[PDB]
Amino acid sequence: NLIKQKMDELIKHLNQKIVSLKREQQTISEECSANDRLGQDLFAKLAEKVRPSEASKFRTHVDAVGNITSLLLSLSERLAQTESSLETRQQERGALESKRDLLYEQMEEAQRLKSDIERRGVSIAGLLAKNLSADMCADYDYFINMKAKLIADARDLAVRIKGSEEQLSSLSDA
């Protein structure tokens, strides 16, 4: 509601900006044509006095100046871009490393907890053995182990499914 309100504004200001930039670049273009005319006059007057090869060399020097200027600027820009992207990658990597630290601590905690649960499980086995038939006990063992196993399998299938769904989405989208 109010987001389109701001967005329209931004888009507008930005269009105005781009139009201005266009204008300025036009001005510069004109100045370029003028200066080129100057160079043309120069080359004519020099073409009068000197040998053809010398005039040619003059011309190629004049072109070369512009060329190497544009080249240097281009490489400068590209370099800058690359630097920027690298820095970005670095920040991202830092974030990921932190996330990893966290995951790890949580894992250690989870392990501690699992050990605890294992001992408790010893206790439970004790309780069942003291209160239920051998059959019922073997049945419990089977039950608990199968519970774990089934959870595992289920998560595996959940993952495979999820991922494959991602793949599909990406393909179909193309």
Add this chain to the structure above:
Amino acid sequence: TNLIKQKMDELIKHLNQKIVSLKREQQTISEECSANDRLGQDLFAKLAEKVRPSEASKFRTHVDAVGNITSLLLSLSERLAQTESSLETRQQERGALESKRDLLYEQMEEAQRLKSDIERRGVSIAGLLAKNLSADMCADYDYFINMKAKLIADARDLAVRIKGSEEQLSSLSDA
């Protein structure tokens, strides 16, 4: 009929098929869990009959804890894996970018050599004009060449800024 389109359709159809089958197997597992769980319930009924309430509660709690911790460890190992596979990528991307940077650096050194050569050649040209042209003409030439360079620079700048503004505009044309 275009091959690639065809192969793609075949591909996504395969994906659909296997997704269906996977859903199937998943349902199977689901029902299994149902059964095994009924088993649990029966066990607990028995024990509950033969034992004090707190002990039955401990049993229940342990039975729940096994499952919960299984799940937790599983999801943690998963998240961990994904994280490491993200790192492995942020590695290769970085390496590639760095190679590109190398190339750009070599190109820059080269281009600098070039600028130097063009410079000395420019000295010679200056000599030529000196010999054949009036001082006014030579001054005019120095001006012209300087202004050429400056104008190229400014035009470059404007071109870049325009490009950027356009990037922003277009990217905002979506949201």
